[PDB]
């Protein structure tokens, strides 16, 4: 439901809150095997999986598990549509 749209000036804390991870590395995708890197601009750990309800290490690949965060690579099994819904932040020096 929509009543009005407010446009404030975002502070540092809001920017930190909007992000589930920090981009600590400048690579986009691996030149070989064509997958996102562990800390790159396309990392699955930050923006979610690229395959529906799958995992980076392949240990979890079914809707049998959803919302579970993997204990070895950090990617949570969830719909792939989250990759257009989650943001990241860069902490400036």
């Amino acid at each position: 439901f929509f009543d009005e749209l407010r446009i404030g000036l975002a502070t540092a804390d809001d920017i930190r809150n909007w992000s589930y991870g920090e981009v600590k590395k400048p690579e986009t995708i691996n030149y070989r095997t064509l997958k996102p890197e562990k800390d790159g601009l396309f990392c699955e750990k930050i923006f979610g999986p690229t395959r529906d309800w799958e995992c980076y290490c392949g240990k979890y690949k079914r809707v049998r598990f959803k919302g579970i965060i993997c204990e070895r690579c950090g990617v949570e099994v969830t719909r792939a549509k989250v990759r257009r819904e989650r943001m990241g932040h860069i902490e400036l020096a």
Partner: protein, 1109 residues
């Protein structure tokens, strides 16, 4: 003239003193000049020219001699060569490779420090040699080069008034071939401020002081002017170094000035060929405009300081307003302001110069690279081949054809379309009028277009005016100015000397109209003759005043506009529309020449190159549908191959067929085979059929058209169309892609017409969605869903690890496979990198006319097909023949094209023979009718030359003197009307209706390929919106004005549905589809992707857009 021309009686009353010249000379002659063919030098020499130079030889002579920084050694180029084309035209086109021939230039090296010299040939790439039909073939596609209209170099005197102060100021803009421009000025305050470049303005006195002339010299030659009288005392500077240094600082502020570089830099930008250059044309124009170097053929091609002071002198004289002036040493010349759109300074650069520009750029870059590479190498073992790297020139030539906006797919919709594409003139493209600006003022007709550029033929889109076709009789002067022929006339007598004149040189004389009368000797019968005059105006003058005359009435119209009978009875708008539409006529299965037409239809075909012609007189030996053979009279045998069912660039059929029989004695230049739109060597773009002008039950309301079912039964308007599908098999990182008959998840009956190698059989009929080529590709996704596992375990389809990505017919296309081609890396075919195999399949289909098709006449009367009616529903003449087409009456007068009525009446006169009795002499209305027109048989053909056609009196007499039918009666009275019987009720119509035979076309804007619609299917990735365009399931666009209309209706819910559910609501589309399939209630729409993406963007910009409730 033409041996095989069918006898077509013509209404022509005037005689032709000059036959129509070649219709493709503009392209071929320019190309021959570019390559410098000896067969072009032989003609250039005849023009009284000594030691003519080819264009490429000119480009090489520009860089001849070459030198380095210290002139230790010099390089040189000369003598381009051409060995032979790599392959034939047909082989080059079918092997989708590029037509070209090797180019060799002989290079020479001289050592100044030692005197050692050497020379050898250097391979300088492969040059795309032109074909005989004036086209190039690149990557298996035929392309044409369209000339570009531009502003010629010279001095442009101009004037303008000031709105605020009502003062007039003058300027002299000078545009060079290359470099930086400059312009004089006369400010309202009398300050003569030059803007030497995009830099700022200063008085011209400083410009003149900076080079040579002192303070006391200026008074010698300009001691009769007021503005300079004031200027010589308004300014204050006597030191040449100061003026030089002042101009140096203002030109390049912030740089260290020196007393020698001050002269060095100014000389490096106006008076040196390596930076600033005016072409051969520029010097000619400047010299004749100002009278300098009268008659001298001097080769100078860059500014001369004498001409600059002559320019300021001319400006001074013009500001005063004197009629003429004279430069000391030159000749007397007139003083006037120059028109910028006048074709005396607007010039067209053709294919030759367009190619030469790119060659020049490539050679310049190559010269830069070689002058860099020279330094490292030694001075004994060095050779030109080691020095030169031909990469830039070849790369730039190859980039020109494949990327230049002036290289265009040839419009192979019909022979006339291609013929009028090669002769097109364009103002757009690089180096011309920027498409963003597109000034509205330059689009209108200027009085100099007469006989040079057609005023009727232009695109009807936003490109109106900017693009037009060349005239029929026009030829291009070597300088790039369009000439036109005129008959020399003398003291009341017309002579046999035809002279080509340019616009400027024609402006000096008086030119009379062609239609004016003359006696047998050539004397003017009438005392006062109507002529044209210098202002581009129409006046009357006595006999003594006349000085020239036009060559023929058709001189001012192009080829296409010339093929419209009774053009003078049609307004310019409808004539333009008809000329444009004549280029959209699709060829039919069987061609039929118009019953009534111009005399041009013949040549427009022969010069189009789509009709096989005899190369030598002789006898036909053997004739076959695939090729013809002829035996010359000098013991020589020639063989011509005929193209069959070939695809055109636009999808039509480029069929050819013979017209000769064994034992026929042909003559040189005689048509042997017909092109797509040809019959007996005459252009046949459509069909002539029976038409009656009358409204009919509203089915033809608002310019719609009604057709008899006969035209569908006997395939009168059926056309063949061939599409070309492709698919390439190429490797991937999970495995290679294979072409095979077998593909997963299909029945064996789906593969009925598939070879063992996957490709469909030749001649097999393919429906929508059928398989043309089976191509499985690696998938490797092993973890199938448990339900699929169970199903595949139940049945025999255990499992597979590959996809079914086969090539399938587009949803909407169907036909029969007429051909297949396969290219494979297995035999080292030139497959572009990254491809293993490639297969092309041709699918051809016949198309009968149907509802929604578009037909038009030659007079801009196009319409859709509202209804096709049974033969028994059509109105029929008393003899019983039904009418084929019926056109609404109300459209004829308001749209204002009466030429179609005369066309219909003369078509009836031609269909049924005519004869006029001679008892009391010839009838008065037939006093001037030629003898051969007195009597003609049935189903004859007539020619009505444009601007010399049959006057309405002669046509009325012909209507009144028609012959009867088989029953000895006349169906159409002397007024061109006949009674008609209603096919529905049977009662005769209360009043007579006008009937005849009209020649109609079939336009390529068919309904068979424009209908499309979408329910649900593929979308766009990034935008999450349904994609559109040519592809299947192309969605429609709900623009902004549509939203405004919905808002005005107050349709809040429908607007939301059209904006969220049906466009970009990813979670809503599936739910709506499943609700429809289940019949449940439609769920309310959710948040569209657009708003979410906008919110995320604004958040990314560190703006905390928070939604409130």
């Amino acid at each position: 003239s033409v041996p095989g021309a069918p006898n077509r009686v013509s209404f022509a009353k005037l005689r032709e003193p000059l036959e129509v010249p070649g219709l493709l000379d503009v392209q071929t002659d320019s190309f021959e000049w570019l390559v410098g063919s000896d067969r072009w030098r032989q003609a250039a020499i005849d023009r009284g020219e000594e030691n003519p130079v080819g264009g490429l030889e000119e480009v090489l002579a520009e860089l001849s001699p070459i030198e380095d920084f210290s002139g230790s050694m010099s390089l040189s180029f000369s003598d381009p060569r051409f060995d032979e084309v790599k392959a034939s035209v047909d082989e080059c086109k079918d092997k989708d490779m590029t037509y070209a021939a090797p180019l060799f230039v002989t290079a020479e090296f001289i050592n100044n420090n030692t005197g050692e010299i050497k020379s050898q040939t250097v391979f300088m790439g492969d040059f795309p040699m032109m074909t005989e039909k004036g086209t190039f073939i690149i990557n298996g596609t035929e392309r044409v080069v369209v000339s570009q209209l531009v502003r010629s170099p010279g001095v442009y005197f101009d004037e303008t008034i000031d709105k605020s102060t009502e003062k007039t100021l003058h300027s002299v803009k000078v545009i060079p071939g290359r470099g930086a421009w400059l312009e004089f000025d006369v400010d309202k305050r009398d300050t003569v401020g030059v803007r030497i470049d995009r830099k700022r303005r200063q008085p011209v006195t400083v410009l003149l002081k900076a080079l040579g002339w002192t303070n006391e010299q200026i008074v010698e030659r300009f001691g009769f002017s007021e503005i300079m009288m004031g200027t010589l005392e308004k300014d204050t500077t006597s030191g040449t170094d100061e003026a030089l240094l002042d101009i140096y600082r203002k030109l390049r502020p912030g740089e260290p000035p020196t007393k020698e570089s001050a002269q060095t830099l100014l000389e490096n930008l106006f008076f040196k060929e390596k930076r600033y250059d005016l072409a051969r044309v520029g010097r000619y124009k400047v010299n004749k405009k100002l009278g300098l170097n009268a008659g001298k053929p001097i080769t100078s091609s860059t500014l001369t300081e004498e001409d600059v002071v002559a320019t300021i002198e001319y400006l001074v004289r013009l500001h005063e307003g004197q009629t003429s002036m004279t430069v000391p040493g030159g000749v007397e010349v007139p003083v006037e302001v120059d028109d910028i759109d006048h074709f005396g300074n607007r010039r067209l650069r053709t294919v030759g110069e367009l190619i030469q520009n790119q060659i020049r750029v490539g050679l310049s870059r190559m010269e830069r690279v070689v002058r860099e590479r020279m330094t490292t190498q030694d001075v004994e073992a060095i050779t030109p081949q080691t020095l030169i790297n031909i990469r830039p020139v070849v790369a730039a030539i190859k980039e020109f054809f494949g990327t230049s906006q002036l290289s265009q797919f040839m419009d192979q919709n019909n022979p006339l379309s291609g013929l009028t594409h090669k002769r097109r003139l364009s103002a757009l493209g690089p180096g011309g009028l920027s498409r963003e600006r597109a000034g509205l003022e330059v689009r209108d007709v200027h009085p100099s277009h007469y006989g040079r550029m057609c005023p009727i033929e232009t695109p009807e889109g936003p490109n109106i005016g900017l693009i037009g076709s060349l005239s029929v009789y026009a030829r291009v002067n070597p300088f790039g100015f369009i000439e036109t022929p005129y008959r020399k006339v003398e003291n009341g007598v017309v002579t046999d000397q035809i002279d080509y004149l340019t616009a400027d040189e024609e402006d000096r004389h008086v030119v009379a109209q062609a239609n004016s009368p003359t006696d047998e000797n050539g004397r003017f019968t009438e005392d006062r003759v109507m002529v044209r005059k210098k202002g581009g105006e129409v006046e009357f003058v006595s006999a003594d005043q006349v000085d020239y005359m036009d060559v023929s009435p058709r001189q001012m119209v192009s080829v296409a506009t010339a093929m419209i009978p009774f053009l003078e009875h049609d307004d310019a708008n409808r004539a333009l529309m008809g000329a444009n539409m004549q280029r959209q006529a699709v060829p039919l299965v069987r061609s039929e020449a118009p019953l009534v037409g111009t005399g041009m239809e013949l040549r427009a075909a022969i010069d189009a190159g789509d009709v096989v012609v005899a190369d030598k007189t002789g006898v036909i030996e053997e004739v076959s549908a695939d090729y013809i053979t002829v035996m010359a009279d000098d013991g020589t045998r020639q063989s011509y191959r005929l193209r069959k069912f070939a695809r055109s660039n636009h999808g039509t059929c480029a069929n050819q067929r013979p017209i000769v029989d064994a034992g026929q004695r042909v003559e040189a230049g005689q048509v042997i085979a017909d092109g797509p739109c040809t019959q007996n060597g005459e252009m046949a773009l459509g069909k002539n059929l029976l038409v009656a002008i009358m409204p009919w039950e509203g089915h033809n309301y608002e310019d719609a058209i009604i057709l008899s079912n006969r035209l569908v039964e006997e395939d009168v308007l059926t056309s063949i169309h061939i599409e070309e599908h492709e698919i390439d098999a190429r490797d991937t990182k999970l495995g290679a892609e294979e072409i095979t008959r077998d593909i997963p998840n299909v029945s064996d009956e789906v593969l009925a017409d598939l070879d063992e190698r996957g490709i469909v059989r030749i001649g097999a009929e393919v429906r929508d969605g059928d398989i043309l080529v089976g191509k499985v590709t690696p998938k490797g996704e092993t973890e199938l869903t448990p339900e699929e596992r169970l199903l595949r375990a139940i049945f025999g389809e255990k499992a597979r690890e590959v996809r079914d990505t086969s090539l399938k017919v587009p949803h909407g296309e169907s036909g029969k496979v007429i051909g297949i081609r396969v290219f494979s890396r297995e035999d080292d075919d030139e497959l572009p990198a990254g491809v293993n195999e490639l297969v092309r399949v041709y699918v051809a289909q016949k198309r009968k006319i149907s509802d929604g098709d578009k037909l038009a006449g030659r007079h801009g009367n196009k319409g859709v097909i509202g209804k096709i009616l049974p033969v028994e529903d059509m109105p029929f003449l008393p003899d019983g023949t039904p009418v084929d087409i019926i056109l609404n009456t109300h459209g004829v007068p308001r749209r204002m094209n009466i030429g179609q009525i005369l066309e219909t009446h003369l078509g009836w006169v031609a269909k049924a023979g005519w004869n006029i009795d001679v008892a009391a002499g010839v009838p008065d209305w037939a006093s001037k009718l030629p003898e051969e027109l007195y009597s003609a048989p049935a189903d004859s053909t007539v020619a009505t030359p444009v601007f010399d056609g049959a006057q309405e009196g002669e046509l009325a007499g012909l209507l009144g003197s028609t012959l009867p039918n088989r029953d000895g009666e006349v169906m159409v009275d002397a007024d061109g009307k006949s009674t008609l019987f209603d096919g529905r009720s049977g009662e005769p119509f209360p009043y007579p209706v006008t009937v005849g035979y009209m020649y109609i076309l079939k336009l390529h804007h068919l309904v068979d390929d424009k209908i499309h619609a979408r329910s649900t299917g593929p979308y766009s990735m990034i935008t999450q919106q349904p994609l559109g365009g040519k592809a299947q399931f192309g969605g429609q666009r709900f623009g902004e004005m549509e939203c405004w209309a919905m808002q005005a209706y107050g349709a809040a819910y429908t607007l939301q549905e059209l904006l969220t559910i049906k466009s970009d609501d990813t979670v809503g589309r599936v739910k709506v589809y499943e609700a429809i399939v289940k019949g449940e209630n439609i769920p309310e729409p959710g948040i569209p992707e657009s708003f979410k993406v906008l919110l995320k963007e604004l958040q990314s910009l560190c703006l905390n857009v928070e939604v409130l409730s």
